[PDB]
Symmetry: none
Subunit: 30 residues, 8 copies
């Protein structure tokens, strides 16, 4: 319950890595 | 409570799909 | 506790609106 | 448990700052 | 950025008028 | 944006034909 | 990217001076 | 996108050589 939430919020804090690095793909095209 | 949180964190893990695919719209313009 | 989490996950599901509309700012420059 | 979730949802509401300001990097290149 | 590029490409499409008319100067010396 | 830039760069690569052929006007007056 | 494009569009707006002055070469041979 | 724009701006900076040398054709007819 709480732990398998905290280990989703694991996944989001990966998505907010791939936000950053796949923005930084775009910024470094521009 | 916990379940209807986990099935929001469903929605975010959709938003972090549409992050990716609607970045990949931009990258593939550039 | 749970409710004042669910009404943050309110805020994120606003941030994932302003993700979309402030991407769609960029796409519609390009 | 709940508090150390709420202080992750701290981190996301930082990532959704750096979403905004590192989009606004791109928009202000364009 | 993009708008103040496309409005240089304004200036070039003036240079490619003044190309033309200041050749049409020479052609009408000849 | 990008497409309606690249399709100006269409127009310039016409101006750089009409550069050429309306010089080849002068060269064949001479 | 965009800056090192706009500073090519620098070079072209030099070529469209040296267009002009090296025509004004010919016009003043004629 | 950006790369296949900058490598048109390649082609124009060839047209602005062949501007030059095929004027330097005329100047050396005169």
């Amino acid at each position: 319950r709480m732990k398998x939430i905290e280990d989703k919020l694991x996944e989001i804090x990966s998505k907010x890595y791939h936000x950053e690095n796949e923005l930084a793909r775009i910024k470094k095209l521009l």
